[PDB]
Amino acid sequence: KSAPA
Amino acid sequence: KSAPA
Amino acid sequence: KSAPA
Amino acid sequence: GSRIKTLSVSRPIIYGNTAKKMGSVKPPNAPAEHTHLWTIFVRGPQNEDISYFIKKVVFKLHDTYPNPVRSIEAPPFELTETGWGEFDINIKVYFVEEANEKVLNFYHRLRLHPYAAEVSSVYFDEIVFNEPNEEFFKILMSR
Amino acid sequence: GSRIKTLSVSRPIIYGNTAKKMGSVKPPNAPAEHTHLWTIFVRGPQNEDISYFIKKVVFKLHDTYPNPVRSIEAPPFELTETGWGEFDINIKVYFVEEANEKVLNFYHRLRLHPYAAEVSSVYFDEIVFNEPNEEFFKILMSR
Amino acid sequence: GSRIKTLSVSRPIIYGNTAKKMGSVKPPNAPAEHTHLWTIFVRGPQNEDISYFIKKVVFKLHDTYPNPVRSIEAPPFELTETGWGEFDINIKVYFVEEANEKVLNFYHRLRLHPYAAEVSSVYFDEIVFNEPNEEFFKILMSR
C-alpha cells in the first residue's frame, strides 16, 4: 500500500 | 461383457 | 489477372 | 483486434446409461439369467429436442443380444433392455441430411455395478461442428 | 472448474464471388473484350444484416479497372462488374466507430472458370473480435 | 466435420475500480489522512444481472482497513471506501450452490493515480466454466 503518484 | 461387481 | 480456363 | 478463423458451432449433448438391479419378481418373458434393467441414451440438456440436427442414433449392443445393431430413428434416442453383464456400446450418431456430415462415432461402457437402487454413467459434453455449410448453420441456429 | 480468460466474440461471415459467362448478346456498353459478369461480396448467413457492426467494405480491384478502390458504404456489401480475367481482390472490412478496431484485411481470388452457367467461390468463416470494449460488445450482442 | 469435446460455457465479466481525489471538504467522519474515494466492483456488461450465477463476492482489503474481509452477498457486488493508498485486492467470487464450483480467485491493484477528476482501472474479461453440471448449465442458459 503506497500513496499514489 | 462381464457380470457386474 | 489471367483469362479463365 | 479482429481476425478470420474457421467457423465452428457446438451443441451440448448428454449420453450414457441408467441401470437398476431387478428385484425378486422380474418382468414377464425376461431371460431368467438377466439381472438388470438398463437404458442407453443420447439426449439434449433439460431434455430439449435434438432431432432438429440428429437424424437417428444407432446403438451396437454386444453380440449376446439378437439384432445387436439397434437403429433409433425418432426421439427419444434411447433404448431399454434387460441383461446380465456390462459391455462396451458403440454409439453412432447420424446428422440430418443437410449437415452433409459423416457419422459421429463414440463408445460407452454400460454401467450396472453400484456406487463406491439406480446407478448411472452419464457424460455431459458437446458436439463441435467444423465448417458447417450455410443451410446446416441455419438449422443449428433455429434452436 | 472456472477460470478467467480474455473475452472474445465471433461473428460468422460469408464472402467471395459468383460469376457467369456472358452469352452472345452482352449488356449494353460492356467492353467488347469482357466475357463474364461477376459479383464480389461480404454478407451475413441467411443474408442477415451485418451493418450493425461493419461500417463499410472496400474492394480493391485489379488496376485494369478504373477507380479500382471501390468503397461500399451501405449494405449489401457487394459490387457487380464485367471483365475478362481472374485476379486477386483485397477486401478491406471496416467496423463501426464504436468497435475502435483496425481494418480487417483479407484476399479473394475472383473465380470465373467452370467446375471440375453460374460458378461461385464462397467461404463461410467467422470474424473473431479480441477483447471488445463494453460498448462494442453491446452492439455485437444486439443481433 | 464433427467431434466430441468437453463442454464449456463462458460468462463475460467486468471488474476493477473507479476512484476520485477528494476536494477540500471531505465527507463527514472520513479519516483526516484519507485523500481519495473509490469503488471496487464485479459486475455484468451493461450492468446486467450476474447474481443468477454468482452467490457472493468477497473483497479482501489491505490490513489498514478494519474488518478487511468484506463479504458482499447481494448485488451490486461492489463496495465504496475512502483511503490514502493503492494496494492489491484479492477478489473472491463464489458461485451459486448448484454450480458445485470452487471459489474463483483473482487480484486487482486499486488505482488512484491520475492518467498519463475520475480515474478507473477496469477489465472486461470472461469466466469460463469447465464441464458444468446439467443443473448449472440450465441456470447459465436462463440469461
Coordinates of C-alpha atoms in Angstrom, one line a residue:
Chain A
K1 CA 0.0 0.0 0.0
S2 CA 1.6 3.2 -1.2
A3 CA 0.2 6.8 -1.6
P4 CA -0.4 7.4 -5.3
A5 CA 1.5 9.5 -7.8
Chain B
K1 CA -19.1 -58.4 -21.3
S2 CA -18.8 -59.4 -17.7
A3 CA -21.3 -59.7 -14.8
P4 CA -21.0 -56.6 -12.6
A5 CA -19.5 -56.2 -9.2
Chain C
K1 CA -5.0 -11.3 -63.9
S2 CA -5.4 -14.1 -66.4
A3 CA -8.3 -15.2 -68.7
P4 CA -10.0 -18.2 -67.1
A5 CA -9.8 -21.8 -68.2
Chain D
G1 CA -8.5 -6.9 -32.5
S2 CA -10.1 -8.9 -35.3
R3 CA -9.1 -12.0 -37.3
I4 CA -10.7 -14.5 -39.6
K5 CA -10.9 -18.1 -38.4
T6 CA -12.7 -21.2 -39.5
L7 CA -16.3 -21.3 -38.4
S8 CA -17.4 -23.9 -35.8
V9 CA -20.6 -24.4 -33.9
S10 CA -21.0 -26.6 -30.8
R11 CA -24.1 -28.4 -29.4
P12 CA -24.2 -29.8 -25.9
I13 CA -25.0 -33.4 -25.6
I14 CA -25.8 -35.8 -22.8
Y15 CA -25.3 -39.6 -23.3
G16 CA -24.7 -42.8 -21.3
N17 CA -26.9 -45.2 -19.4
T18 CA -29.0 -45.6 -16.3
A19 CA -29.5 -49.0 -14.7
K20 CA -31.2 -50.9 -11.9
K21 CA -30.8 -54.3 -10.3
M22 CA -34.1 -56.2 -10.7
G23 CA -36.0 -57.5 -7.7
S24 CA -37.2 -61.0 -6.9
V25 CA -40.0 -60.7 -9.4
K26 CA -38.7 -59.9 -12.9
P27 CA -40.6 -58.6 -15.9
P28 CA -42.5 -61.3 -17.8
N29 CA -40.5 -63.1 -20.5
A30 CA -37.2 -61.5 -19.4
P31 CA -34.5 -64.2 -19.8
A32 CA -34.0 -65.9 -16.4
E33 CA -30.3 -65.1 -16.3
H34 CA -30.9 -61.4 -16.8
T35 CA -30.4 -59.5 -13.6
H36 CA -30.6 -55.8 -14.5
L37 CA -32.8 -53.3 -16.4
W38 CA -31.0 -50.6 -18.2
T39 CA -31.4 -47.7 -20.7
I40 CA -28.7 -46.3 -23.0
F41 CA -29.4 -42.8 -24.5
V42 CA -28.3 -39.7 -26.3
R43 CA -30.3 -36.6 -25.4
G44 CA -30.2 -32.9 -25.0
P45 CA -29.8 -30.9 -21.8
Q46 CA -33.1 -30.4 -20.0
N47 CA -34.4 -33.0 -22.4
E48 CA -34.6 -30.3 -25.2
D49 CA -35.1 -31.6 -28.7
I50 CA -32.0 -32.7 -30.6
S51 CA -33.8 -34.2 -33.6
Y52 CA -33.5 -30.9 -35.4
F53 CA -29.9 -31.8 -36.1
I54 CA -29.7 -35.6 -35.3
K55 CA -31.5 -37.8 -37.8
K56 CA -31.0 -41.2 -36.0
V57 CA -28.8 -42.9 -33.3
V58 CA -27.6 -46.4 -33.8
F59 CA -26.5 -48.4 -30.7
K60 CA -24.4 -51.6 -31.4
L61 CA -25.1 -53.9 -28.4
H62 CA -22.9 -56.9 -27.5
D63 CA -23.3 -59.9 -29.8
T64 CA -25.2 -61.8 -27.0
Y65 CA -28.2 -59.6 -28.0
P66 CA -30.2 -60.6 -31.0
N67 CA -30.2 -58.0 -33.8
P68 CA -27.5 -56.1 -31.9
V69 CA -27.4 -53.2 -34.3
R70 CA -30.3 -51.1 -32.9
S71 CA -31.3 -48.1 -35.0
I72 CA -33.5 -45.4 -33.3
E73 CA -34.8 -43.2 -36.0
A74 CA -37.1 -40.8 -33.9
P75 CA -36.7 -39.2 -30.5
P76 CA -36.2 -40.1 -27.7
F77 CA -32.8 -41.5 -28.9
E78 CA -32.6 -44.3 -26.3
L79 CA -33.4 -48.0 -25.8
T80 CA -34.2 -50.1 -22.8
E81 CA -33.0 -53.7 -22.3
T82 CA -32.5 -56.3 -19.6
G83 CA -29.3 -58.2 -19.3
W84 CA -26.7 -59.7 -17.0
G85 CA -23.4 -58.1 -18.0
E86 CA -21.5 -54.9 -18.6
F87 CA -20.0 -54.3 -22.1
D88 CA -19.0 -51.5 -24.5
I89 CA -21.6 -49.9 -26.7
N90 CA -20.6 -48.2 -29.9
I91 CA -22.9 -45.2 -30.3
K92 CA -23.3 -44.0 -33.9
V93 CA -24.9 -40.5 -34.2
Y94 CA -26.1 -39.6 -37.8
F95 CA -26.9 -36.0 -38.5
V96 CA -29.7 -34.6 -40.7
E97 CA -29.2 -34.8 -44.4
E98 CA -28.5 -31.0 -44.7
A99 CA -25.4 -31.3 -42.4
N100 CA -23.5 -33.3 -45.1
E101 CA -21.7 -34.8 -42.2
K102 CA -20.2 -38.3 -41.6
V103 CA -21.3 -40.4 -38.7
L104 CA -20.2 -39.3 -35.2
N105 CA -18.7 -42.4 -33.6
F106 CA -18.3 -42.9 -29.9
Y107 CA -18.3 -45.5 -27.1
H108 CA -19.9 -46.0 -23.7
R109 CA -19.3 -48.8 -21.3
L110 CA -22.6 -49.9 -19.9
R111 CA -22.6 -49.4 -16.1
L112 CA -24.5 -51.8 -13.8
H113 CA -22.4 -52.1 -10.7
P114 CA -23.4 -50.0 -7.6
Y115 CA -21.6 -46.9 -6.4
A116 CA -18.5 -46.7 -4.3
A117 CA -31.3 -48.8 -6.4
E118 CA -30.4 -46.9 -9.5
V119 CA -27.0 -46.4 -10.9
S120 CA -26.0 -44.2 -13.9
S121 CA -23.0 -43.4 -16.0
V122 CA -23.7 -40.2 -17.9
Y123 CA -21.5 -37.7 -19.7
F124 CA -22.4 -34.1 -20.5
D125 CA -20.1 -33.0 -23.4
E126 CA -20.7 -31.1 -26.6
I127 CA -20.5 -31.9 -30.3
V128 CA -18.4 -29.4 -32.3
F129 CA -19.4 -28.9 -35.9
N130 CA -16.4 -27.9 -38.0
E131 CA -17.1 -25.6 -41.1
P132 CA -20.8 -26.2 -41.3
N133 CA -22.5 -25.3 -44.5
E134 CA -24.9 -22.3 -44.6
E135 CA -28.0 -24.5 -44.7
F136 CA -26.9 -26.6 -41.7
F137 CA -25.8 -23.5 -39.8
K138 CA -29.4 -22.2 -40.3
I139 CA -30.8 -25.4 -38.9
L140 CA -28.4 -25.3 -36.0
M141 CA -29.2 -21.7 -35.1
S142 CA -33.0 -22.3 -35.1
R143 CA -32.8 -23.7 -31.6
Chain E
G1 CA -14.0 -25.6 -12.8
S2 CA -13.8 -21.9 -13.5
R3 CA -11.1 -19.6 -14.8
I4 CA -10.7 -16.0 -16.1
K5 CA -9.7 -15.7 -19.8
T6 CA -9.7 -12.9 -22.3
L7 CA -13.1 -12.1 -23.8
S8 CA -13.7 -12.8 -27.4
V9 CA -16.8 -12.7 -29.6
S10 CA -17.1 -14.2 -33.1
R11 CA -19.4 -13.3 -36.0
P12 CA -20.0 -15.7 -38.9
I13 CA -19.2 -14.1 -42.3
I14 CA -19.8 -15.2 -45.9
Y15 CA -17.6 -13.8 -48.6
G16 CA -16.4 -14.4 -52.1
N17 CA -17.8 -14.1 -55.6
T18 CA -20.4 -15.5 -58.0
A19 CA -19.8 -15.4 -61.8
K20 CA -21.4 -16.3 -65.1
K21 CA -20.0 -16.5 -68.7
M22 CA -22.0 -14.0 -70.8
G23 CA -23.9 -15.1 -73.8
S24 CA -23.8 -14.0 -77.4
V25 CA -25.5 -10.7 -76.6
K26 CA -23.7 -8.8 -73.9
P27 CA -25.1 -5.9 -71.8
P28 CA -25.0 -2.5 -73.5
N29 CA -21.7 -0.6 -73.2
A30 CA -19.9 -3.5 -71.7
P31 CA -16.3 -3.5 -73.1
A32 CA -16.2 -5.8 -76.1
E33 CA -13.4 -7.9 -74.6
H34 CA -15.3 -8.6 -71.4
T35 CA -16.6 -12.1 -71.3
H36 CA -18.0 -12.6 -67.8
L37 CA -20.4 -10.9 -65.3
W38 CA -19.4 -11.3 -61.6
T39 CA -20.3 -10.2 -58.1
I40 CA -17.9 -9.9 -55.1
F41 CA -19.5 -9.7 -51.7
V42 CA -19.2 -9.8 -47.9
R43 CA -22.5 -10.8 -46.3
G44 CA -24.2 -12.5 -43.3
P45 CA -25.5 -16.0 -43.1
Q46 CA -29.1 -16.2 -44.4
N47 CA -28.4 -12.7 -45.7
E48 CA -28.9 -11.3 -42.1
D49 CA -27.8 -7.7 -41.6
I50 CA -24.1 -7.2 -40.8
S51 CA -24.1 -3.4 -41.0
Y52 CA -24.8 -3.2 -37.3
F53 CA -21.0 -4.0 -36.8
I54 CA -19.5 -3.4 -40.3
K55 CA -19.4 0.3 -41.4
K56 CA -18.1 -0.2 -45.0
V57 CA -16.3 -2.7 -47.2
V58 CA -13.6 -1.7 -49.7
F59 CA -12.8 -3.9 -52.6
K60 CA -9.5 -3.2 -54.4
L61 CA -9.9 -4.4 -58.0
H62 CA -7.1 -5.1 -60.5
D63 CA -5.5 -1.9 -61.9
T64 CA -7.2 -2.7 -65.3
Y65 CA -10.4 -1.3 -63.7
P66 CA -10.8 2.4 -63.5
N67 CA -11.1 3.8 -59.9
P68 CA -10.1 0.3 -58.7
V69 CA -10.6 1.2 -54.9
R70 CA -14.3 0.5 -54.6
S71 CA -15.8 1.7 -51.3
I72 CA -19.3 0.3 -50.4
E73 CA -20.6 2.3 -47.5
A74 CA -24.1 0.8 -47.1
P75 CA -25.5 -2.8 -47.4
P76 CA -25.4 -5.0 -49.4
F77 CA -21.6 -5.0 -49.2
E78 CA -21.1 -6.2 -52.8
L79 CA -20.4 -5.0 -56.3
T80 CA -21.1 -6.3 -59.7
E81 CA -18.7 -5.9 -62.7
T82 CA -17.9 -7.4 -66.1
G83 CA -14.5 -8.4 -67.1
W84 CA -12.3 -10.9 -68.9
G85 CA -9.8 -12.2 -66.3
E86 CA -9.4 -13.7 -62.8
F87 CA -7.3 -11.7 -60.3
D88 CA -6.8 -11.3 -56.5
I89 CA -9.1 -8.9 -54.7
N90 CA -8.0 -7.3 -51.4
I91 CA -11.2 -7.0 -49.3
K92 CA -11.0 -4.3 -46.5
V93 CA -13.7 -4.6 -43.9
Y94 CA -14.1 -1.5 -41.6
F95 CA -16.0 -1.8 -38.4
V96 CA -18.4 0.7 -36.8
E97 CA -16.7 3.6 -35.0
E98 CA -17.6 2.1 -31.5
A99 CA -15.5 -1.0 -32.2
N100 CA -12.3 1.0 -32.1
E101 CA -10.9 -1.7 -34.4
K102 CA -8.3 -1.6 -37.2
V103 CA -9.3 -2.7 -40.6
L104 CA -9.9 -6.4 -41.3
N105 CA -7.7 -7.3 -44.3
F106 CA -8.3 -10.3 -46.5
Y107 CA -8.0 -11.6 -50.0
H108 CA -10.1 -13.5 -52.5
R109 CA -9.2 -14.8 -55.9
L110 CA -12.0 -14.0 -58.4
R111 CA -13.3 -17.3 -59.8
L112 CA -14.6 -17.3 -63.4
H113 CA -13.7 -20.8 -64.7
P114 CA -16.2 -23.6 -64.7
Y115 CA -16.4 -26.5 -62.3
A116 CA -14.4 -29.7 -62.5
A117 CA -23.9 -21.5 -66.1
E118 CA -23.1 -19.9 -62.8
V119 CA -19.8 -20.5 -60.9
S120 CA -19.0 -19.4 -57.4
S121 CA -16.2 -19.3 -54.9
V122 CA -17.6 -18.6 -51.4
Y123 CA -16.2 -19.0 -47.9
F124 CA -18.2 -19.3 -44.7
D125 CA -15.9 -18.4 -41.9
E126 CA -16.2 -16.2 -38.8
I127 CA -14.7 -12.9 -37.6
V128 CA -13.2 -13.2 -34.1
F129 CA -13.2 -10.0 -32.1
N130 CA -10.5 -10.0 -29.4
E131 CA -11.1 -8.0 -26.2
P132 CA -14.0 -5.9 -27.5
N133 CA -14.9 -2.8 -25.4
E134 CA -18.1 -2.7 -23.5
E135 CA -20.0 -0.5 -26.0
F136 CA -19.0 -2.7 -28.9
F137 CA -19.9 -5.8 -27.1
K138 CA -23.4 -4.3 -26.5
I139 CA -23.7 -3.7 -30.3
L140 CA -22.5 -7.2 -31.1
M141 CA -25.0 -8.8 -28.8
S142 CA -27.9 -6.8 -30.1
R143 CA -28.2 -9.3 -33.0
Chain F
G1 CA -16.8 -32.4 -39.6
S2 CA -17.9 -33.3 -36.0
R3 CA -16.2 -34.3 -32.8
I4 CA -16.9 -34.6 -29.1
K5 CA -15.1 -32.3 -26.8
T6 CA -15.6 -31.3 -23.2
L7 CA -18.4 -28.8 -22.6
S8 CA -17.5 -25.3 -21.5
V9 CA -19.6 -22.1 -21.0
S10 CA -18.3 -18.6 -20.7
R11 CA -19.8 -15.5 -19.0
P12 CA -18.4 -12.0 -19.6
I13 CA -17.4 -10.2 -16.5
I14 CA -16.3 -6.6 -15.8
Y15 CA -14.3 -5.9 -12.6
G16 CA -11.9 -3.3 -11.2
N17 CA -12.3 0.1 -9.5
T18 CA -13.1 3.7 -10.1
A19 CA -11.6 6.5 -8.0
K20 CA -11.6 10.2 -7.4
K21 CA -9.3 12.5 -5.4
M22 CA -11.4 14.2 -2.8
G23 CA -11.8 18.0 -2.6
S24 CA -11.0 20.5 0.1
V25 CA -14.2 19.5 2.0
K26 CA -14.2 15.7 2.7
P27 CA -17.2 13.5 3.7
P28 CA -18.0 13.7 7.4
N29 CA -16.1 11.3 9.6
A30 CA -13.7 10.2 6.9
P31 CA -10.3 9.8 8.4
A32 CA -8.3 13.0 8.0
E33 CA -5.4 11.3 6.2
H34 CA -7.7 9.7 3.6
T35 CA -7.5 11.5 0.3
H36 CA -9.5 9.5 -2.2
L37 CA -12.9 7.9 -2.6
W38 CA -13.1 4.7 -4.5
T39 CA -15.3 1.8 -5.5
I40 CA -14.2 -1.8 -6.3
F41 CA -16.7 -4.0 -8.2
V42 CA -17.5 -7.1 -10.1
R43 CA -20.4 -6.6 -12.5
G44 CA -22.0 -7.7 -15.8
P45 CA -21.8 -5.9 -19.1
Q46 CA -24.4 -3.2 -19.5
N47 CA -24.9 -3.8 -15.7
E48 CA -26.9 -6.9 -16.5
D49 CA -27.6 -9.2 -13.5
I50 CA -24.9 -11.6 -12.6
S51 CA -26.4 -12.9 -9.3
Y52 CA -28.1 -15.7 -11.2
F53 CA -24.8 -17.5 -11.1
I54 CA -22.7 -15.5 -8.6
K55 CA -23.8 -16.0 -5.0
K56 CA -21.4 -13.5 -3.3
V57 CA -18.2 -11.6 -3.9
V58 CA -15.6 -11.2 -1.1
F59 CA -13.1 -8.3 -1.3
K60 CA -10.0 -8.6 1.0
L61 CA -8.8 -5.1 1.6
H62 CA -5.4 -4.1 3.0
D63 CA -4.9 -4.7 6.7
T64 CA -5.0 -1.0 7.3
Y65 CA -8.8 -1.3 6.9
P66 CA -10.8 -2.7 9.9
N67 CA -12.7 -6.0 9.1
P68 CA -10.7 -6.2 5.8
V69 CA -12.6 -9.3 4.6
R70 CA -15.6 -7.6 3.1
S71 CA -18.4 -10.1 2.0
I72 CA -21.0 -8.7 -0.4
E73 CA -23.8 -11.2 -0.5
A74 CA -26.4 -9.4 -2.8
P75 CA -26.0 -7.3 -5.9
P76 CA -24.4 -4.8 -6.8
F77 CA -21.2 -6.7 -6.0
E78 CA -19.2 -3.7 -5.0
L79 CA -18.1 -1.6 -2.1
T80 CA -17.1 2.1 -1.7
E81 CA -14.3 3.3 0.7
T82 CA -12.1 6.2 1.3
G83 CA -8.4 5.9 1.8
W84 CA -4.9 7.2 1.1
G85 CA -3.0 4.4 -0.7
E86 CA -3.0 2.0 -3.6
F87 CA -2.8 -1.8 -2.7
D88 CA -3.7 -5.2 -4.1
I89 CA -7.2 -6.5 -3.6
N90 CA -7.9 -10.3 -3.6
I91 CA -11.4 -10.7 -5.2
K92 CA -13.1 -14.0 -4.3
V93 CA -16.1 -14.8 -6.5
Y94 CA -18.4 -17.6 -5.1
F95 CA -20.9 -19.2 -7.4
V96 CA -24.4 -20.4 -6.7
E97 CA -24.7 -23.6 -4.8
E98 CA -25.9 -25.5 -7.9
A99 CA -22.6 -24.8 -9.7
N100 CA -20.7 -27.1 -7.3
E101 CA -17.7 -24.8 -8.1
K102 CA -14.7 -23.8 -6.0
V103 CA -14.1 -20.1 -5.4
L104 CA -12.8 -18.0 -8.3
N105 CA -9.7 -16.2 -7.1
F106 CA -8.3 -13.1 -8.7
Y107 CA -6.5 -9.9 -7.9
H108 CA -6.8 -6.2 -8.7
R109 CA -4.5 -3.3 -7.9
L110 CA -6.5 -0.4 -6.6
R111 CA -5.8 2.6 -9.0
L112 CA -5.9 6.1 -7.6
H113 CA -3.3 8.0 -9.5
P114 CA -4.3 10.2 -12.5
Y115 CA -3.9 9.3 -16.2
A116 CA -0.8 9.7 -18.3
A117 CA -11.4 14.1 -11.8
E118 CA -12.2 10.4 -12.0
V119 CA -9.8 7.6 -12.7
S120 CA -10.6 3.9 -13.3
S121 CA -8.9 0.6 -13.8
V122 CA -11.4 -1.8 -15.3
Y123 CA -11.0 -5.2 -17.0
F124 CA -13.6 -6.7 -19.3
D125 CA -12.8 -10.5 -19.5
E126 CA -14.9 -13.6 -19.2
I127 CA -15.3 -16.5 -16.8
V128 CA -15.0 -19.9 -18.4
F129 CA -16.9 -22.7 -16.7
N130 CA -15.3 -26.1 -17.4
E131 CA -17.7 -29.2 -17.5
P132 CA -20.7 -27.6 -15.8
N133 CA -23.3 -29.9 -14.5
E134 CA -26.7 -30.1 -16.1
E135 CA -28.5 -28.0 -13.4
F136 CA -25.9 -25.3 -13.5
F137 CA -25.9 -25.3 -17.3
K138 CA -29.7 -24.7 -17.1
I139 CA -29.1 -21.7 -14.8
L140 CA -26.3 -20.3 -17.0
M141 CA -28.5 -20.5 -20.1
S142 CA -31.5 -18.8 -18.5
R143 CA -29.9 -15.4 -19.2

